[PDB]
Symmetry: C3
Subunit: 45 residues, 3 copies
């Protein structure tokens, strides 16, 4: 039961890395969308 536990922990850590990488990508795209909205605002105003 300790080895199974260790394996499940390694899997959780692996998925946590995936999650952190996805959050980083989402933040970069979100920043681009903010910039794009601000550009459009300037062009409209």
């Amino acid at each position: 039961r300790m080895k199974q536990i260790e394996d499940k922990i390694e899997e959780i850590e692996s998925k946590q890395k995936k999650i952190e990488n996805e959050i980083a990508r989402i933040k970069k795209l979100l920043q681009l969308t903010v910039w794009g909205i601000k550009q459009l605002q300037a062009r409209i105003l």
Copy 2:
């Protein structure tokens, strides 16, 4: 101690699945916002 650990793993995995679900929803809305910005850009240009 090993039953407490096993139970805490199951809880962590549950929370991780909630997080994954929430990220999927965020990504879908973010994609819609990208489409909406692109439509505005094309309209104005």
Copy 3:
């Protein structure tokens, strides 16, 4: 090996909370971008 597991669990939980908090911040910004897009739509149309 149970103590090392318990310490890894604490670290995983620590990170999971940070991830949850970051998702909450992303959601707040994404709500503001949706609002900003709708404002531009209304003005253009």
